[PDB]
Every structure is written in structure tokens, then in C-alpha cells.
Amino acid sequence: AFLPSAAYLTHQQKVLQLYKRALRHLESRCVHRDKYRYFACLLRARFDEHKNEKDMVKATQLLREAEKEFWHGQHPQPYIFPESPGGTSYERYECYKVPEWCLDDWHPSEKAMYPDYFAKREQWKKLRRESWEREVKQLQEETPVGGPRTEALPPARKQGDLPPLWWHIVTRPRERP
Amino acid sequence: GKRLFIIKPSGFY
């Protein structure tokens, strides 16, 4: 469907995602833990019944009518975790996730308020800008002709290189600023 | 005790 590394969902991955969503929507239907525990073992038994089906046509058909089963039998308001997309606290603190480059635009009277922090930040920016050309020439020597096929990125290969395209993963803001 | 730096834009101006 839509994945960064793989171009598709395999049949095994579709079965696992249906299993997880079936247990979660069942737990939404089955509020108490012992009653969900009983019915979740029954649902595990239903998934373990047709586990060893070798015909991929028959297995895909069973998966399709199991999806129909699930869509008929899902909770209307399922349980969502609070920081999960659709939850009550999802993307709540995005108004506090100030990016790092704003620290470059401070006045010197408030940069001097934190001397060790910015004196330590300058070597981060230094390490970033002397790692940049090495990781760019790493990317243009490893990518095949026609562009990269998948969105996966290589690691660092030498002792001294940093991994390519690392700065906005390492210097992303905390989830609770 | 493990005080964390709060990144915020320049409120000087």
C-alpha cells in the first residue's frame, strides 16, 4: 500500500496487521481484561486454525473474507492511545517543538546566558558541516543509476564517517519540550 | 537536577 522501504505489503504482513487490528478492536469491544483475555485466546485459535494453508489463492481469499468479517465487526469508537494518531493527546506538543536553527537567531545577550550550551553547540555545527561533504560523496557513490530504488539510507562505512543525512534525525526536538 | 534546555525562538526582539 504505502511503505517507505517495501513497495507493498506481503500476505504475511497483511495477516499480521489484520491480527493486531482484530485484537485491538476486540479489546475495544471487550473492555474488561478477563473477558478480553478469553475472547482474545478464542480469536488466536481462529487465526491458528487456518495457519498452515499452502494455497496462496485460498489463503488470500480467506484473508479477504476475514477483512469483511472485521469490517462488519469493528468497534465504532475503538480505543486509541493518547499520543497515537486520533488520540486525545496526539500532536499536542507540536506547538513546543521549536526547531534547532532558531537558536542561531538569538541575540547575544541571551546566547551569553548559556555559554557552555552554545560553546558546545558550535562543535555540533562544526562536526555537521565537515561530515556533510563526506556523506554526500558517500550517497552519490552508492546510489545506483536511475536514482535510489527504496527510501532506505546506508549507514556509515568508515571509522570517522557519520551516517548520511543524520542532522534532522539526531537534532529533532524532544516529544516533551 | 537534570534540567533540560528549552529550545524557543528569540524573544529578545
Binding site: 481484561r33 478477563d34 483475555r37 478469553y38 485466546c41 478464542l42 | -
Partner: protein, 79 residues
């Protein structure tokens, strides 16, 4: 800083409705793998939680005692 967890061996499902769930699963040839993970909810200080009329009648004993004392006080006060 360091938080010492309780023991994983003590959360047994004997004495819980997890025991009843395992019995009604093993009656049909199934077995419950996650009982000891859920065993803490039905044990300890979270066992023997009150009913609904027990929740409504919280403080009914002391309130009724103060009521009887105040009714006796106003019965003695008129005479």
C-alpha cells in the same frame, strides 16, 4: 532514581478470574499465555473493590451516626 519492581513470580492467577478464564479455555483445548501479565489487576490492594451501592453508601455509617446524634441533640434542646 532506581525503581525496584516487585517479583514476577508472585503474580499467580490462582484466586483470580484469570483462573476461571483458563478453566473455560482449557475446557475446549486452549491455553491462556498472558494470565500472569494481567494477574496484578485482580490481586493486591486492587482486589475486593466495592460494588455500586457500596460506592454510593460511602460514609453512610458515619453520616447516619452524626444524624442520630444531631436528632438527639435537637430532641434534648427543645426540652
Amino acid at each position: 532514581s532506581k525503581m525496584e519492581l516487585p517479583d514476577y513470580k508472585q503474580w499467580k492467577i490462582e484466586g483470580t478470574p484469570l483462573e476461571t478464564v483458563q478453566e473455560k479455555l482449557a475446557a475446549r483445548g486452549l491455553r491462556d499465555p498472558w494470565g500472569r501479565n494481567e494477574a496484578w489487576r485482580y490481586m493486591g490492594g486492587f482486589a475486593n473493590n466495592v460494588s455500586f451501592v457500596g460506592a454510593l453508601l460511602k460514609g453512610f455509617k458515619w453520616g447516619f451516626a452524626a444524624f442520630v446524634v444531631a436528632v438527639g441533640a435537637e430532641y434534648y434542646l427543645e426540652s
